[PDB]
């Protein structure tokens, strides 16, 4: 078979929805983060998630060398955090972590303590596919804001949930 | 670092949200599909998605031996399809596909033509991690439905999107 056009693929993907996360890191190689909507759980033993990020980015470089990271599922009121970590407004990488919402838990990675879900993680394995590194990360601590709804991305806009 | 208890990881995941998909297949090993809350896009060249499914599923071995599959992101009105493919009502596998909204496109996998998004795919790589197979699949065709609001799963309930 021939694969669809990359343009067609991206067009279609805009019709699917995703949660919005920020992946962050800190350690000997420094502080960095980016928004990532290609994230999912893998298995519960050992508890493992994966995230797919383009290897060309500033943050990918620092995440992979620090070897630890957080995955932070953002809550409905946090679209501005997603924008900043997606490069909207071009906030310099190290100025992105100003507020008190970011704290360490176990690994030294910054964890967003008011995110719907924050997992603090160690990198266990990496599979490269096309432009992206698929990073498998084992969860060594968790945190949750008080109940709240998710930030969702769909058709190139932010949204949150409602019952059917 | 020690990993979190598996019970803690599962509890945390219920507070994240995911799109609801059905992964389906057909071929020499027969028809099968199942609901899947762990899917994401990987890279656009070649256009690749991944999905993680428990190796103990009846469907998982058939999907991997057939070598082809579809990923169908369900729309807000399709909770009954999700229910059926999560095994509610114990509907026999072949009968799940009797409805004419299920069609082939390119590979022979059943594609849900009215799903918000349906990708028809060939398996390219399988990585087994803990209890699950992480299946990398390249997209060879898609189906384009009209303006489809998502079916989302969050805190053990179905949901759809609203604006912020």
Describe this structure in words.
The structure is a homodimer of 164-residue chains. Chain A is mostly beta strands and 164 residues long. Chain A has one domain: Electron Transport, Fmn-binding Protein, Chain A (Pnp Oxidase, Chain A). Chain A is built from 3 helices and 12 strands. In chain A, the strands form 3 sheets. Chain A has a 7-stranded antiparallel beta sheet, sandwiched between helices. A 3-stranded antiparallel beta sheet of chain A has the order 1-11-12, with no helix packed on it. The termini of chain A are far apart. The interface between A and B is large, with 65 and 65 residues. Chains A, B: It catalyses: FADH2 + NAD(+) = FAD + NADH + 2 H(+).
Widest β-sheet, arrangement of strands of chain A: 3-2-6-9-10-5-4
Strand content of chain A: 35-45%
- Assembly type: homodimer
CATH architecture of chain A: Roll
**How many angstroms does the end-to-end distance of chain A come to?**
38 Å
Query: How would you sum up the major sheet of chain A?
Result: 7 strands, antiparallel
State the secondary-structure class of chain A.
mainly beta
How many beta-strand elements of chain A?
A: 12
Greatest interface: A-B, 65 and 65 residues
Approximate helicity band of chain A: 10-25%
Order of helical and strand elements of chain A: HEEEEEHEHEEEEEE
Radius of gyration of chain A, in Å, reads: 16 Å
CATH structural class of chain A: Mainly Beta
List keywords for this structure.
homodimer; 164 residues; mainly beta; Pnp Oxidase, Chain A; seven-stranded antiparallel beta sheet; three-stranded antiparallel beta sheet; 3 helices; 15% helix; globular; oxidoreductase; NADH:FAD oxidoreductase
């Amino acid at each position: 078979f021939e694969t669809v056009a990359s343009f067609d693929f991206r067009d279609a993907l805009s019709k699917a929805s995703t949660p919005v996360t920020v992946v962050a890191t800190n350690g000997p190689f420094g502080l960095a983060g980016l928004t990532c909507s290609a994230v999912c759980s893998v298995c519960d033993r050992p508890p493992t998630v994966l995230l797919c990020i383009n290897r060309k980015s500033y943050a990918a470089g620092i995440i992979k060398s620090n070897g630890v990271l957080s995955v932070n599922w953002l809550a409905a009121g946090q679209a501005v955090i997603s924008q900043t970590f997606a490069g909207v407004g071009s906030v310099p990488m190290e100025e992105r972590f100003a507020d008190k919402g970011w704290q360490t838990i176990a690994t030294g990675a910054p964890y967003r303590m008011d995110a719907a879900v924050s997992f603090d993680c160690t990198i266990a394995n990496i599979v490269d596919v096309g432009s992206h590194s698929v990073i498998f990360a084992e969860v060594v601590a968790r945190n949750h804001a008080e109940e709240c709804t998710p930030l969702i991305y769909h058709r190139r806009q932010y949204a949150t949930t409602r019952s059917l």
